[PDB]
From a paper:
For the DotBL structure, two identical hexamers could be built, on top of each other, while only one is present in DotBY. The hinge point of this rotation is within the proline‐rich linker. In the hexamer, subunits A, C, and E adopt the α conformation, and subunits B, D, and F the β conformation, yielding an overall threefold symmetry [Fig. 2(C)]. DotBL was crystallized in the presence of AMP–PNP and ATPase activity assays using DotBL preincubated with increasing concentrations of AMP‐PNP show that the analogue binds and competes with ATP resulting in an inhibition of phosphate release. Yet, we could observe density for only phosphate not AMP–PNP. The phosphate is clamped by the main chain NH groups between residues 158 and 163 (TGSGKS) and by the Lys162 side chain. In the vicinity of this binding site (less than 6 Å away), the side chains of Glu191 (Asp box), Glu235 (Walker B) and His260 (His box), together with Arg221 (in α6) from the next subunit, point towards the ligand. In the α‐subunits, the binding site is highly similar, except for n + 1 Arg221, which is further from the binding site due to the alternate conformation of the n + 1 subunit [Fig. 4(D)]. Overall, we concluded that disruption of this interface by mutating those two arginines leads to disruption of the hexamer.
Residue numbers in the entry:
A (entry chain D): 6 to 373
B (entry chain C): 5 to 373
C (entry chain B): 4 to 374
Write the structure that this text describes.
Amino acid sequence: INLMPDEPTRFTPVFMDRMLEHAESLNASDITIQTGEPIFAEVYGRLLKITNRRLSNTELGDLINSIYGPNATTQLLSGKDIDTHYEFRPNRGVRYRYRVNATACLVEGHDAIQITLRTIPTTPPKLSTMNLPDNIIEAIAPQEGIVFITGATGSGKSTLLASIIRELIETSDSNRKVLTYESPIEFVYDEIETISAVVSQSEIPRHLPNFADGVRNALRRKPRLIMVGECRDAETISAALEAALTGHPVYTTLHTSGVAETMRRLVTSFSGEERLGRTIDILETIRLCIWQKLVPTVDERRVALREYLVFDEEVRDILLEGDPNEVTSATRKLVRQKGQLMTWDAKMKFEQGIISERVYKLIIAGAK
Amino acid sequence: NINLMPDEPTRFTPVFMDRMLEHAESLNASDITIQTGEPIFAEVYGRLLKITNRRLSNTELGDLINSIYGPNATTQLLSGKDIDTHYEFRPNRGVRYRYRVNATACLVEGHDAIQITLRTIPTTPPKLSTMNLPDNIIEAIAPQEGIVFITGATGSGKSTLLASIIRELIETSDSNRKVLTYESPIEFVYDEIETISAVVSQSEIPRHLPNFADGVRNALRRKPRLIMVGECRDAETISAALEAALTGHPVYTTLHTSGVAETMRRLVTSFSGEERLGRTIDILETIRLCIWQKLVPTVDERRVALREYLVFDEEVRDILLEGDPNEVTSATRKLVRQKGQLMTWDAKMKFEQGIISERVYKLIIAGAK
Amino acid sequence: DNINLMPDEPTRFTPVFMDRMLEHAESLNASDITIQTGEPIFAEVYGRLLKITNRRLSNTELGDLINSIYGPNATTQLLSGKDIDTHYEFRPNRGVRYRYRVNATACLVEGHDAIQITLRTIPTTPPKLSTMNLPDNIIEAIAPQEGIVFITGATGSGKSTLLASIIRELIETSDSNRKVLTYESPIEFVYDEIETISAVVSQSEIPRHLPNFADGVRNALRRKPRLIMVGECRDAETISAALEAALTGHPVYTTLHTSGVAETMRRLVTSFSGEERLGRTIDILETIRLCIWQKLVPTVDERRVALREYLVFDEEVRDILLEGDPNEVTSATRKLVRQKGQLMTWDAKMKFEQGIISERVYKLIIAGAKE
C-alpha cells in the first residue's frame, strides 16, 4: 500500500512510465486505469489506489494513443477492443514488459476508456520446467508439419509454445529464422540472444491484418519456424496447411478439447467438396497434438494435465490409408495405443498425490 | 559461425547495402535478412551467418526499404501492411543481381520496427550433365506422352531440375517442341538459350492466367509439344494434366509429397469414390516417371541431391493396373525396391563414396523406415 | 536448313502481312502457326517446326495483330490476366477461304509482359454423320422435336465435331425447316459452305457477341429457333436456361465434361440446391432425350477411334425414372444404361474383335469402366 512519489498535475505518457516504476516497486501484478477513477494497482490480491487524482477521458485517450498509435481512440469508439504490448527501460537497467488491453466502457453517461496493464515475464520458461515426457521433446522439432497445442483459454498454451521456441532458438547450430504472429505478443526473445537465430514477432491487429495474412506473409520470408497464435477459422487453417506442405514447421493453438476432437474440428472446418482433399492435407501435415488442461492441486495451486499424440510416419500412414470418413475414431484409438490419454495423466497425478481424488473422478467423468 | 563484410559502415546506407549484397553473393547466400536491433544475416547452404557485427537501427532499415520501394514504404509498414517488391542492381561487373524483397513490420524491444528479406532469383537453367543423373532417368526424361513428377520439399531444386530438362529438350536440334510453362512466380527463363526449332512460352499464374489448371486447359488450346505446370496440388490441376496427357502431351509437374509411393497415394486419393477408380486407371496409364529429390549436407559443408526414382515402364504400369487399387501404395513400394531406386540406397551409396557424413547417413536412415 | 522464309517479309508486321504469311504457311501445309514476342513466326508442318521469318516480332506488333483479330480491347484483356479464344477467316486473291481457331495468351518475355498468338487450321465443313460410325439407334434419337441431347466426355474427345455433324445433317436435308442458333465461344465449325435451302444457322461467340452461355440460350428463346446449340453447360444457370428452352419445346444440344451417362445425370441433378432440386429433377427427367459419352482411344493404325456409351431416353425410360425415388436417380439411370443402353465396355469389346483397338487399351477400358 503506497502512493505515487511525484504525481503530476495532469497525467502524460512520460509520467505513465514513472507510475509504472512505482507500481513495480510495490510488486503489482496488474495496473488498472479508468477515466472516472484513480490509477489502481493489484499487489498480492489487494487493490490499492496509487494516485490521488481521478483521471479524464482526454488523458486516457492520450495514454492509449501513445501506447498503441494515433487511431486507438477512434478504434475504441468504433466498438472494438485493443490488445497490445508495452515495454520500457527505466534507465538502461532492466526492462519492464506488459500486456495492455484497452476497452470501451460507459462512465457518467458518456463513452470512456479503461486500460489494463498485466505484468508479463521477460523470458519464456525453459522447457525442462514444463515437465514434459521425452516423447514430446523428441516430437517437438519437426522439419515440416504442424504442431497443435489445444485447450480452453487459460491452459497456458502460449507459455508452452513460447518455451519451445526458446529451446529451439537458444541452442547452437539451430539455423532458424522464426516468425511469430500474435494477437498480443505475450513473450519476447531479445534476451535469449541465441548465436544463429532470428525471431521476428508481428502483432496481428497492429502489424498485419489477419493471422492467415500473417502466415501467407511468412511463406514469402523463407522462415524455418512459423508461430501462429491461433487458428480459429478455415482461412487460417488453410494458410497453415499450405505453409506446412510447403515444408515449414507451423505451431498453433486451438480451443478444442481432445486430440481426436481436435482432428474433428480440423476436418469439419471445410465444406463437403473440399473436405476430402483438405483431410488428406491435414493428415499428411500434422506432426503432434497436445491438449493441455490446468486443474487445481491439493496445495490449492494449478497443475497441467496433458493428453498428446505424436503423429509418427506410422500413425500418419494408418490414418491416410484408412477410410477418411472416420478419422476421428481412428485417432481416438491411436492415442490409446501410441499416445497418452487425459484420463491416464490424471490418474498418474492422483497416484502422485498432486491432484485431489474429487478432481480425478471429475476428469474421468468428463472424458467418458 | 560469422563471416563479416569487408568494409562495414558506421551507419548503413543504400550505397553500402549494394556492397553488402555482393559480399553475400560471394558467400553463395540464397537469402539475406535485415532486421532492426539485429545484424544482417545471410543463409549460406542452410546455415545462418551474421554478415556484420553491428545491430542495425530502425532508421537505417527504414532508409533501406524506402530506397528499395518508395518514400512511402515506411509509412505503409506503419499502416500495418506488407511490402513485396524486387530489387535489381548492376555490380562493378555490370551483370546485374536481383532479389525478391519483402518488408514486414514487427515489434522489436517494444517499438515498431521493420524486417526486410531478400531472396535470390535464379535465371539460367543448369546443364543436365551437371545434374549428376543416372542414365535410366535420362532415357526416361523425354516421353512422347504422359506425366513426369519431380517431388520433394520446397527448396529441393526441383524447379532447377525441370528447368534443366526443358533446356535439354529445347537446345537439341531436331527437337520440334512448342513448350508452354505455367509457374507461380517465374524464376527460370530460356531467352538466353539459343534454339533452332523450339519455342518457349512462360505464363505466370497470378499475373497471366488465374489457375494452374486453367493454364493447362489453355495449353490444350495452344497445341504444344510440352507442358510445364509448376505445381499440381489439388484434384482440379491433376485432372487437367490427366486430360492433357491422355490427349498425347508430355506433362511435367512437381509435388510436395516425399516418396514415390507416397506421391502415388496422394494422386490416387485426390478423387472421390465414384470418380476414383476410373481416375486411378487414368493416372496409372499416364504416369511415366517419378523422382523424389532431397538436398542433404555434404562433407565439404555444401549440399548434394539424393534421389529416389521409379521409371514407369509399360511392364511396371501393367503390374500396377492388375492389382488391388487400395494396395497401390504398397505395390509401388515393392516396385521402387525391385525396378527403381530407394532414397536409403542412394544415401548408402553416397556414404560409401564419402560424399555424405556418417551422422547424416544415419539421420536419413531414421526417416524412411 | 530447317528454314522456309516468307516471300515478302515486311520491315514491321501488320495484319495484311499476317494474311500473306498465312498464305505462305498453307502453301507449306502447316497445321499450326505460332507468333510470339521476341521470337520469329513458327509454322508446324507435320512433326516439324520451321521458322517462317528471320525477324523476331515486337510486343507492339503482336498486340496489333491480336487487336485486329479480336477487337481493340484484346490487349487490355490479356493484360487483365485473361485468355483469348476466337476464330479468324481470310480470303486470298483466290475465291477460296481460310479459317483458323486463334488463341492469344499472355506470357513473360525478357522480363516484360508479352503476347503469344497461335492459329490452328480449321476445316471448312463438318464431317458427314455417316463418317461418324454411329449406331442406328442414335441416328433415330438425334433429332427430337424437343428436349436436351448431351454429348459428354473429356476435352479432346471430339464432341464439338460430332455436334457439328448432327447440325450439318439436320440443316442439309431438304424439308428440314430449321432455324439453328449456336452459342459456341470459340467458333470452330461454320456452315456457310453447305448453304442449303430451308435452314438458317446463326453462330454467336460467347466472349465476343454475348456475355454468357445462359444469356445466350435465354436470347435464343426470343428468336424462335428450331434448334439451339450451347457449347457447354457448366453452371446451374446455363442448365436452368436450357431446361426452360426445352420445356418451351425446343431441341437443345450441349456438352458436358463428365464421363459416363450415370455420372452426367449425377452432375445435372446435383447442380441445384435442395428446395429447388426436386422440381429441377422432374424437369430434367422430363426434358432429357439422349446422352452420349464419347472417348477417343488409340488404334492399331496409330490413329484414334471413338468409343461411345449412350442411353436414349425413350418415353418409357423417362417414365421409369420419374416414377421412382428422386434421390437415387443416378443408380436407376445406371441400370437403365445396362438394360436399354450401351456401355463403354461393350463398345470397347466390339471394337477389339473388329481389331480396331489393341488388347492392352481395350483391357484398360474394361478396368476403368468395370469399376
